[PDB]
Structure formats: C-alpha cells, structure tokens
C-alpha cells in the first residue's frame, strides 16, 4: 500500500514579483550584516512539488491546503499514513501539491527591519495573527471543546502534537496575488483539477474564473462562501445573534457564470449541528458556513452549472473532520473522489 | 530513464519543538475568529521532515540538511528543473531524509496575535527580521564578483536565476541551541545516519555529532562557520578590507568536540575562492579565510585521531561549482564524490 512508481519527481518556484531598498549595491563593502541597500527582494512566490506516474491517465489534480497549512496534509496523515499525493499517484494522476505564498516554502515577504516593512512600506502587516491548538481543535471537528472527541471519530487520536505542529500563521499577503501565482501554475501544467480544502475554496474558485485549463472543482469543507456582486442571499447570524460568518466574496458575474461550465463538488464531513448550537461557537459556524455554500451552489446551478454538495455521512462514512483527507478513513475518503474524477471522465486521456 | 524513482514508502512527519501558552482559559461558546491569545496553546519551535525510501536500501540513511535562509527544495530540484540529491540517492539505495528546520519552509514560524514573534509579554523570536537580498546571496554564492555577472567558468543554471533566488528567505531568530535539539530528536529517531550539510547547517551538524552518537558521518558543502574547541581558537586573519573579520568559530567544550574525531567528516569547496587577499570583493575574500579558518578546524579534529578531510572540487577536475555544488550543472558529478566518500566508508553497505 505505501509503494510509489514515479516517471519523474520535482518542485519549482512560480509567481511572485520583486521590490526593491533604496541605493546600489556595492561588493566591496561587507555584505554581512543584510542590509536593504541596493537590495532587489523576490516576494510572494509559490513552492510547487510534483510527481508523475509512469502512464498517467486523466488530468493532473492539484491539492491546495487550507488555511495556516502546507502541503505536507496531502503527503501523509499525521500518524504516518499515506496522504492524497501517495494515493493518487497510485491512481495513475500526476499530482501537484503546492505551498501558497505565505506558507510553508512559500515566500514570507520580509526583510531588514520591523517584519512585513520595507523602509517606509509596509508589504505585509507586523501585527501577526495565528489561531491556537484550542481554536483549530473546535474548528477542525475533533470534538466540541479542546481535549473532547466526538463518538466514532475518524481523528488519528493520539497523534494529537503532530497534527497541530502542521499549523501556522499567515501573513497579510493579497489574496488576489494567490490567486495570481496558481493562475500561473495552472497556465504552465495545462488541464487540471484543483482539490482545495478550507481557506483555499473561496480561492480555488477564483482562479477557476480566470484560468480556463481548470477543468473541475473538488472543495473539501470550504471556509468562504462565493455569490455574484449584489446577489448575496440572506444569511443569518450565529445562534449567539451576535456573530455572522465569513463575510461571502462577491465577483462580477461574467466571471462567477464561468463556475457553471465545470464540475464541482464541495465535501463536508459529519458532526456539523442541523440545529442552532449556542453552546459551541464553531460548530454553530459550520452549520450556517454549510447552509451558505448550499446557497452558492444553488447559484451555480442557476446558472447552468453542475455544483454538488457531499456530505459523507449520507454516502456511509461517519465521524469524519474537517481534514477528510487525513483522518483514518481517508482512504474511503480517496475512493469517493476518484469516483467524482471518474463520473466526469478527469481519469481518461 | 534519469528521472525515474521507485519508492518503497515515501512521507513526511514533524519533530521536535516545545509549547508556549498564553493568559487565561478558553471558552467554546465566545467567537473563535478574530483569533485570540486567551487560553491558547501554541506548539512552535518544530521540523519538517520527508523522507523518500527506496526498495532494498543499502547502507545508512542520509540526512539533507539546508543552508542558511533555504528549504529542502535544494535537495529535490535544481533551480532549472534537474534532478537533485534526493533523487539521484533514492536512485543510489539509501533512504533519504530532507528537511525544513525549525523557522524555515515548512518547519515553525513562532508568531502568534500581536506584533511578529511576540506572544504577550514575551519575545519568542525579534519583530526586527533581517534577510538577504538578490545582490547579496549572488556573491555569497558565487556565481560571479557582482551580482548578474557570472565567472566564465560558472556551474551554475544560467537563465533560471529567478527561479534560484525565489528559494531563499529570512529565518527568525531562533536560537541555534532549538535548531540543534530538533535534529538530535531526528537522528534519535531515525537511527545510524549520515548528515549531509551546507552553509549555515555545517557548524549546526557538527554540533549534532557531538550530542548524538547515530551520526556516523559528515558531508558538509561549503560550510560557512567553523568550529573549534574552547580557548583553542586559532589566529585568524581579518579580511582584505583589513576591518571585516569572518564568523566568529563555535567554541565548544573538547570533552564533545573530541567526539568529531570518531567518524568520517568531509567538507567540499566549489571553486573560485581566491588563493591572495581580495578587497575588491568582500565575499570572496570572505570564502578565502574561511575556508582557511574550516582547514584549521579539521586538522585541530586530525591531531585527535579524527578523520576529516577537505575536498576542493576543482582538484577533483570539477571546474566552476558555486556554493550550492549539489544544484549545479555538474551536480551529477558531485553526487558521485558523495557515493565515492560513502563507499570508502563502508556508509553504503548494510
Ligand atoms: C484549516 O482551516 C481553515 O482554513 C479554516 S476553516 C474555518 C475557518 C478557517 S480559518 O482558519 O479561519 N481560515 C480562513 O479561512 N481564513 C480566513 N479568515 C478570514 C477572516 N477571512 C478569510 O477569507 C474569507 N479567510
Ligand atoms: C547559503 O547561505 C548561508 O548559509 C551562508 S554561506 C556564507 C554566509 C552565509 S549566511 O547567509 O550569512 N548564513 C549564515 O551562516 N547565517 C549566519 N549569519 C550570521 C550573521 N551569523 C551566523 O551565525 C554563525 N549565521
């Protein structure tokens, strides 16, 4: 189960654009301690790996991670199973995993000074924000308060620390220029499908919009909703009556009907509340975050679209978080994927 | 073919690093997002590592470890798309391990909410960050006297310098001693090994070696501070500019370093690096007194019944190699000087 063939395995740089300090740069003079001086900073780029079978068959899948994440969710599980990239490969598709601007080998924009400033610029905020192992144990699913685990939970309980050691802040890069840079990455591979997973939903589905070589969307538990400008459904509040969701992205609805041309599938795992859950502020969130992006997709589907929604629970698979993809069942979790691939002929050359 | 790769398992993990909590309890019921320091945990401080295992491996697994400001990408793929180290060693029977270290590519960056590295009252890591430029890492590296010139004779990529540049970045101050833990932690779990350093990661090998036994071996390219015991640190000169001085060498106590003398280390110089004085051009002036002040480090290792050896590529008939010879046009070469020190070893026999 954990032997791979590959034709050929790599990674590259993509995207990103350069700024610049102030004067010329002079080699006589000691280049230690870095100074802004003369200096041309690359920012903003994207780390892509890959790997190929030996006779692909269907279109390559890029899987984008989720908020605070890298691509190390799709090379293993955090108890050491294999991850999407091992199983797909498998599968017979060339898999991209990438590591957005911002993440993981992705660039962190910085440089001599207070974090994020370039002389008087400031390229990104020097205030940081990063959720806690208790705020992405609520969001996550893994129980309804930190330490607590739902019954029949598909969480590779006890591998707790590896899993949170996974997660880390983000700078305030432009969204538009992550979208940007996997533009790009899908302008170089051709034909693909992205695979995106929380945070990256709302930005999977951007880059759809402007890069025709996207030929499927499968989001596993989206973040942010997605509507055309000015159409915006009603949307209540949280049961607190207080606390709304992540305000839904609006686009331009020439760009939003492209959505409709392709096929896409948003998966949810279990435990999300049916019912106002005031007790638990994220499980409360997911409830009305899901009824959101039922919404969108009913959109979509206004449009001539074929946008579903899976919630694994109803196709036999239950206790699943918020990761489908890592938790113990992920490889039935693979399974019903491949089917999406396959209905959609994806698989086939 | 070249690029073809046959893994038995292949996968990555986290190791190491500590916790660090902030003021107060946590309540599921208060909005989750914006996201708070109160009753938070934070993990920071932990490694990245992947590893890649080939079918019927022989000998000891290989440990790639990063220079200053990069990742394991430099292990996987030259800057114009070749195959790296960790391929053509999977292809060569050892299972190879490639990592992010703790503040760089995919290990932790210790920040939280508030300003950079600051977790309340306390300073994890400094809110002033420092990082090279372009013009900077190009004459660190080599690749010519100033930046977008190249040595006639130059190994490296040309037309992919974007792509080169893109991988490098600024490391927040995490102290060395955390860096060091999480590899010991990795060598502890991994059993026998090899560390195959570079740059910043050479001083931070030898420093594993003396604290982890599992260490059999040493390849560092290019390592870019020596080391030396307490109080025996040689003279060594400044820089031509006669106001610059190099690193200044780690001093450790000689009860560990004499531990540097039980096994096989190698350091590996490209080329370039002026034999006079040359104050026209401080980094390479710079290369010049430290490789001098490294040839001191290992003879000081010899006289205790070491092993250590300096390899300077050009005496080998490799011409041009840059600081970074494992992603060089030749690096093909220059992974055979690395099977041919592992050989002479016994490292690649099970
Ligand atoms: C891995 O988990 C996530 O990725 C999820 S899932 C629910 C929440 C989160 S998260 O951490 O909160 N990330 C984000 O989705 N980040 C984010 N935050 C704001 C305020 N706006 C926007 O864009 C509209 N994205
Ligand atoms: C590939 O890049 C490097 O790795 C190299 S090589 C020559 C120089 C460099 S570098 O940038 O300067 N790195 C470091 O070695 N980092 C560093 N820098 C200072 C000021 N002190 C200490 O502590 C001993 N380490």
Same mark, same amino acid.
């Given at each position: ?179 940007? #840079?996997?533009? =790009? /990455? ?7 499908? %992205?695979? +995106?997973?929380?945070?990256? @939903? ?96 009913? #959109?979509?589907? =206004? /449009? ?7 919630? %694994?629970? +109803?196709?036999?698979?239950? @206790? ?30």
């Amino acid at each position: 189960k954990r032997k791979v063939v590959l034709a050929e395995q790599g990674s590259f740089y993509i995207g990103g654009r350069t700024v610049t300090g102030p004067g010329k740069f002079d080699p006589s003079k000691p280049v230690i301690r870095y100074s802004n001086e003369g200096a041309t900073f690359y920012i903003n780029q994207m780390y892509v790996n890959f790997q190929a079978p030996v006779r692909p068959r269907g279109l390559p899948l890029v899987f984008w991670h989720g908020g605070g994440l890298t691509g190390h969710i799709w090379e293993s599980t955090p108890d050491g199973r294999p991850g999407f990239q091992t199983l797909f490969v498998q599968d017979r598709h060339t898999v991209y995993t990438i590591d957005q601007p911002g993440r993981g080998r992705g660039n962190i924009p910085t440089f001599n000074g207070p974090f994020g400033q370039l002389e008087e610029e400031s390229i990104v905020n020097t205030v940081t924000g990063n959720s806690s192992k208790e705020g992405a144990w609520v969001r996550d699913r893994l129980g309804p308060a930190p330490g607590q685990f739902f019954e029949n939970s598909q969480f590779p309980r006890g591998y707790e620390d590896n899993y949170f050691k996974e997660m880390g802040f983000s700078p305030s890069i432009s969204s538009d220029e992550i979208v940007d #840079a996997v533009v =790009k /990455l899908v302008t170089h591979i051709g034909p693909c499908v %992205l695979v +995106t997973h929380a945070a990256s @939903g709302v930005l999977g589905m951007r880059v759809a919009t402007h890069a025709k070589n996207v030929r499927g969307i499968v989001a596993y538990e989206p973040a942010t909703s997605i509507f055309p400008k000015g159409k915006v459904p009603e949307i209540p509040p949280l049961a607190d009556k207080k606390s709304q969701i992540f305000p839904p992205f609006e686009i331009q609805e020439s760009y939003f009907k492209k959505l409709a041309k392709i096929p896409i599938q948003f998966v949810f795992g279990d435990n999300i509340p049916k019912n106002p859950k005031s007790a638990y502020w994220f499980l409360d969130w997911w409830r009305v975050t899901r009824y959101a992006h039922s919404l969108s997709l009913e #959109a979509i589907n =206004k /449009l001539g679209g074929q946008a579903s929604l899976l919630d %694994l629970p +109803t196709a036999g698979l239950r @206790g699943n978080t918020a990761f489908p993809f890592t938790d113990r069942n992920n490889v039935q979790v693979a399974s019903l994927l491949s089917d999406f691939l396959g209905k959609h002929g994806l698989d086939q050359n």
